[PDB]
């Protein structure tokens, strides 16, 4: 509890800053009189009225015990006006102007009072899909229909359907049973209370995790007064178990950074966090065509691995790169034998120094190619596909100012990586899929490597059925999409035919969270672990690392 004069003296200047906005302030200076103002339904919408005078009064008369209560009322006033008035209206835009003045005023005042910040924070809104169509989606603030907070429909494709009954999966629900609502909900950030001074701070600002510091949160202010420091965070990236692969990659990266000798470079940590054996099954079209006649294996075994790179930024771990791979060993049947495929990779653009970021991503990929080559994998495979809009390959909720490359830029990026790999004599050469097939004198679809989740298994299903029994347009399909599909020769020619068994020295690593991309995306979504800002990514990394350490 601060002395009421202490609060008044500190906060009143922020309130005056709003008052002295003419004419913007005027609509907010006195309690809304619904009838006088010619608006009867105001209290049907606004259930907790608030205005400057009411706030001034509570402030003058010591009704606030702590400054966030003042901030909450200010924001209640603003949201009341944004709620009742149209986006295009006068009062709405006035309100917006006041809120901007307020945000700028309030932040340094709150910090003067011993707080992390004075900002009002809320999480990004989740994207709502549609059960009506494959990748239909609902837009923020626009109206939609939902059932059991589970089945949602865009206002268009909801009214599309003839009649008054919807079908969810095989049971039938009257339209009247759906909720009509706007996608305008934003969840506030959480606070944690200093156990000594009692100040409430943003959990993400102070990075307090209950598992890491179970004794409780104590702010930096209180710690410094008694010359204390937080107990060490033992749930770090560095303390995750090492592997031969992780070590090899991180040595390559850090040796590169040391050669560059750029100011303010940090050490990179690379960890393999999952390794398990899986199988890809041939889909029904291709299986009817070639498996049932014994021309192709019904399935192919591979090892999947997930790996991540971390850097320390402002004293804290930051996960900035992630990748999953499929590795088809020497025991695997043709056509997949001794091949690696990149399932997906992703990044969060906070790496320092910026001007070595791309270089470092390339070093990770070149190192990985070099490593599997050494094990006796002959060939790498890359599908250059950027994420579609609003999908994330690995990291939930990217920074809005992280641009997503289009296909031509992404293709060139892989080419630049591979060209460096060739000049280092790691990659022998590489070709697009069409040229490679030509060189291999390929004649049938059963000869194409068959990877989990890849383009070619799906397009082959489509092709066989379109042609009513089918390979017919295979060269044409390859030519058409060729720029997107890289085939990378690690071990060339006669040497590729007489190799010893592939023996991976690294053990299996059971981690369900990292068995493919879905589980970590789901976790992140369910726990508001975004990678959309430096501070949120630092929080999300901290939580990810606790999860990886605790199993
Ligand atoms: C693939 C990836 C690691 C490469 O990123 P990168 O090497 O750091 O740099 P990019 O390819 O993003 O692009 C480089 C520059 O183009 C800009 N840029 C990227 N796309 C752009 C676009 N479409 N329009 C305008 N500018 C663009 C970036 O802002 C960057 O500018 P800068 O010189 O200030 O750094 C990263 O783009 C990523 O994680 N992307 C999303 C996932 C993805 O595309 N995965 C592919 C799966 S195969
Ligand atoms: Zn804060
Ligand atoms: Zn729809
Ligand atoms: Zn404190
Ligand atoms: Zn530089």
UniProtKB/Swiss-Prot annotation:
Span of domain CBP/p300-type HAT: 234-551
Function description: Functions as a histone acetyltransferase and regulates transcription via chromatin remodeling. Acetylates all four core histones in nucleosomes. Histone acetylation gives an epigenetic tag for transcriptional activation. Mediates acetylation of histone H3 at 'Lys-122' (H3K122ac), a modification that localizes at the surface of the histone octamer and stimulates transcription, possibly by promoting nucleosome instability. Mediates acetylation of histone H3 at 'Lys-18' and 'Lys-27' (H3K18ac and H3K27ac, respectively).
Outcome of swapping residue 344 to R: Loss of activity
Record gene name: EP300
Effect of residue 451 to A: Abolished acetyltransferase activity
Species whose genome carries this gene: Homo sapiens (Human)
Protein name: Histone acetyltransferase p300
Phenotype when changing residue 540 to Y: In a pancreatic cancer sample
Binding site for acetyl-CoA: 345-347, 357-358, 404, 409, 413
Notes concerning its domains: The CRD1 domain (cell cycle regulatory domain 1) mediates transcriptional repression of a subset of p300 responsive genes; it can be de-repressed by CDKN1A/p21WAF1 at least at some promoters. It contains sumoylation and acetylation sites and the same lysine residues may be targeted for the respective modifications. It is proposed that deacetylation by SIRT1 allows sumoylation leading to suppressed activity.
Modified residues (N6-acetyllysine): 133, 283, 420, 446, 473
Effect the entry attributes to changing residue 518 to R: 70% decrease in activity. 90% decrease in activity. 90% decrease in activity
Effect seen on changing residue 304 to R: 40% decrease in activity. 90% decrease in activity
Effect of residue 123 to E: Increased acetyltransferase activity
Quaternary organization: Interacts with HIF1A; the interaction is stimulated in response to hypoxia and inhibited by CITED2. Probably part of a complex with HIF1A and CREBBP. Interacts (via N-terminus) with TFAP2A (via N-terminus); the interaction requires CITED2. Interacts (via CH1 domain) with CITED2 (via C-terminus). Interacts with CITED1 (unphosphorylated form preferentially and via C-terminus). Interacts with ESR1; the interaction is estrogen-dependent and enhanced by CITED1. Interacts with HIPK2. (Microbial infection) Interacts with human adenovirus 5 E1A protein; this interaction stimulates the acetylation of RB1 by recruiting EP300 and RB1 into a multimeric-protein complex.
Consequence of changing residue 189 to K: Increased acetyltransferase activity
Residues covered by the Bromo domain: 2-109
Taxonomic superkingdom: Eukaryota
Residue segments, region Interaction with histone: 344-346
Post-translational modification: Acetylated on Lys at up to 17 positions by intermolecular autocatalysis.
Subcellular location(s) of the protein: Cytoplasm; Nucleus; Chromosome
Disease: Defects in EP300 may play a role in epithelial cancer.
């Amino acid at each position: 509890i601060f002395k009421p004069e202490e609060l008044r003296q500190a906060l009143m200047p922020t309130l005056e800053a709003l008052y002295r906005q003419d004419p913007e302030s005027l609509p907010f200076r006195q309690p809304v009189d619904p009838q006088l103002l010619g608006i009867p339904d105001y209290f049907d919408i606004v259930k907790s009225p608030m205005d400057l005078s009411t706030i001034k009064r509570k402030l003058d008369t010591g009704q606030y015990q702590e400054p966030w209560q003042y901030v909450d009322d200010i924001w209640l006033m603003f949201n009341n006006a944004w709620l009742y008035n149209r986006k295009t209206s006068r009062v709405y835009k006035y309100c917006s102007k006041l809120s901007e003045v307020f945000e700028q005023e309030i932040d340094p005042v709150m910090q003067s009072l011993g707080y992390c910040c004075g900002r009002k924070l809320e999480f990004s809104p989740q994207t709502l899909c549609c059960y009506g169509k494959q990748l239909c989606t609902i837009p923020r603030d626009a109206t939609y229909y939902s059932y059991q907070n589970r089945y949602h429909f865009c206002e268009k494709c909801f009214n599309e359907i003839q009649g008054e009954s919807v079908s969810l999966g095989q049971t039938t629900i009257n339209k009247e049973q759906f909720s009509k609502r706007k996608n305008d909900t934003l969840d506030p950030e959480l606070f944690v209370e200093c156990t000594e001074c009692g100040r409430k701070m943003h959990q993400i600002c102070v990075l307090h995790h209950e598992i890491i510091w179970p004794a409780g949160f104590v702010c930096d202010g209180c710690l410094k007064k008694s010359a204390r420091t937080r107990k060490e965070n033992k749930f770090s990236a560095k303390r995750l178990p090492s592997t031969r692969l992780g070590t090899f990659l991180e040595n390559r990266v850090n040796d590169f950074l040391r050669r560059q000798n750029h100011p303010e470079s940090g050490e990179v940590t690379v960890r393999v966090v999952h390794a398990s054996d899986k199988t890809v099954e041939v889909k029904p079209g291709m299986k009817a065509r070639f498996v049932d006649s014994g021309e192709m294996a019904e399935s192919f075994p591979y090892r999947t691995k997930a790996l991540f790179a971390f850097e320390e930024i402002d004293g804290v771990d930051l996960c900035f790169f992630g990748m999953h791979v499929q590795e088809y060993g020497s025991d695997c049947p043709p056509p997949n034998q001794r091949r690696v495929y990149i399932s997906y990779l992703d990044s969060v653009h906070f790496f320092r120094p910026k001007c070595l970021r791309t270089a470092v991503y390339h070093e990770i990929l070149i190192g990985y190619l070099e490593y599997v080559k050494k094990l006796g994998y002959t060939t790498g495979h890359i599908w250059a596909c950027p994420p579609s809009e609003g999908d994330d390959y690995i990291f939930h909720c990217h920074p809005p100012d992280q641009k997503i490359p289009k296909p031509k830029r992404l293709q060139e990026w892989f080419k630049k990586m591979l060209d460096k790999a060739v000049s280092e004599r790691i990659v022998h050469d590489y070709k697009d899929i069409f040229k490679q097939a030509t060189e291999d004198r390929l004649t049938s679809a059963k000869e194409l490597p068959y990877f989990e989740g890849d383009f070619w298994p799906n397009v082959l299903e489509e092709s066989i059925k379109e042609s009513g029994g089918s390979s017919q347009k295979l060269y044409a399909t390859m030519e058409k999409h060729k720029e997107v599909f890289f085939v990378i020769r690690l071990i060339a020619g006669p040497a590729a035919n007489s190799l010893p068994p592939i023996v991976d020295p690294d053990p299996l690593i059971p981690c369900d969270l990292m068995d493919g991309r879905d589980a970590f995306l789901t976790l992140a979504r369910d726990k508001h672990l975004e990678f959309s800002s430096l501070r949120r990514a630092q929080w999300s990394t901290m939580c990810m690392l606790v999860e990886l350490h605790t199993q």
